Amino acid sequence: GPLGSIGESEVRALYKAILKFGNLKEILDELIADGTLPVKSFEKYGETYDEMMEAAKDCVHEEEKNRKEILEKLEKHATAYRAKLKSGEIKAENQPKDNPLTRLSLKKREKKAVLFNFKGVKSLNAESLLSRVEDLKYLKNLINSNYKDDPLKFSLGNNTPKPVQNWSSNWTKEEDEKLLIGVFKYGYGSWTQIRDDPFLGITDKIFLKKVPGAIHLGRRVDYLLSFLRGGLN
Ligand SMILES: [Cl-]
Ligand SMILES: [Cl-]
């Protein structure tokens, strides 16, 4: 390791490449060749990757543990209040504006960010890193298990996605299949290469006042991989 250690600028660079390609330990040679990362030994980059994903896991487990203990308390207070309504001591058509049922609902619906600091770099998002790595590992294994000879034959079967009939172009189950084959080939966020691939045939259906643009495609991929893995339940 005579080329020096890993610093803040190399960290910022590793974080962006993971959000795009997932687990990147098998493509280190390619990321150095085009200047994305400066030259260090392969071992140093692998060890840093592992350390980052470990800090992300710990962060996510710690916050779930706290949320769960608070929800257990509010559920207990809510049970007591129900016996009061059924018996008449409080009246259902005349409840106080601040009550045990509104307190439970607020926490249940709460959406807050889960963040950590790494090697001088501040405010990395633990949930974004973990979801992206697991979603892209699922997509690679599904396609190699079933369509090894020719990825272009990939199909959704009877699994039925929510329609987008208000887009500018005509977008159906077949266009959803070609979009996921494109991410398997080129990475998350590579929308120009996906649009211009002549074999996928969606060149005229993407708009880089026209919808879909870059923001709509990102949201569509996050929804489709969550749904196939059973995450809507
Ligand atoms: Cl080195
Ligand atoms: Cl691209």
CATH 3.60.9.10 fits 1-125, yes or no: no
Residue 182: CB atoms within 10 A of its CB come to 21
> Using CA atoms, how far apart are residues 227 and 148, in angstroms rounded to an integer?
23
Q: Find the ligand nearest to 43 CA.
A: 1
Token pair recorded at residue 82: 């129900």
Cβ atoms of 161 and 220 within 8 Å: the answer is no
| Cα(194)–Cα(216) distance, integer angstroms | 14
Kindly identify the ligand whose nearest atom is closest to the C-alpha of 186: 2
Please give the Cα distance from 140 to 7 (Å, whole number).
31
Check if the beta carbon of residue 111 is closer than 8 Å to that of residue 63: no
Task: Give domain limits for the chain.
Answer: 1-125, 126-233
| Dist. CA 184 → ligand 2 center (Å) | 13
Cα of 19 vs centre of ligand 1, distance in Å, is 25
Distance, in Å, from the CA atom of 25 to the CA atom of 200, rounded to the nearest integer, reads 28
Both tokens assigned to 17 = 């490449």
For domain 126-233, give the CATH number: 1.10.10.60
- Which run of H or of E encompasses 185? helix 173-186
The CA 187 to ligand 2 mean position distance, Å, reads 9
| Expt. technique | X-ray
Say which residues have a Cβ less than 8 Å from residue 137's Cβ, sequence separation at least 6: 22, 23
Ligand at shortest distance from the CA of 32: 1
Cα(68) to ligand 1 centroid in Å equals 44
**CA of 169: how far to CAs of 94, 112, 165, 193, 210, in Å?**
51, 35, 9, 19, 8
In CATH terms, are 1-125 and 126-233 the same topology?
no
State the distance from the centre of ligand 2 to the C-alpha of 181, rounded, in angstroms: 14
142/188 Cα distance (integer angstroms): 17
Q: Give the resolution to one decimal, in Å.
A: 2.0
CA dist 221 and 199 (Å) reads 20
Q: Angle 223-228-231 (CA atoms, 0-180°, nearest 5)?
A: 70
- Gaps (C–N > 2.5 Å) in the chain: which residues precede them? 208
For residues 58 and 199, give the distance between their C-alpha atoms in angstroms, rounded to a whole number.
Answer: 42
- DSSP code of residue 36: S
- Span from the CA of 32 to the centroid of ligand 1 (angstroms): 13
Q: How far apart are the first and last CA of the chain?
A: 48
For ligand 1, the distance from its centroid to the CA atom of residue 39, given in whole angstroms, is 7
In angstroms, the CA 153 to CA 151 distance is: 5
Helix (H) or strand (E) holding 139: helix 126-146
206 alpha carbon, closest ligand: 2
Query: What's the rounded Cα separation, in Å, for the pair 181 and 139?
Result: 9
Backbone angles phi, psi at 7, to 5 degrees: -115, -170
| Residue 6 CA, ligand 1 centroid: distance in Å | 9
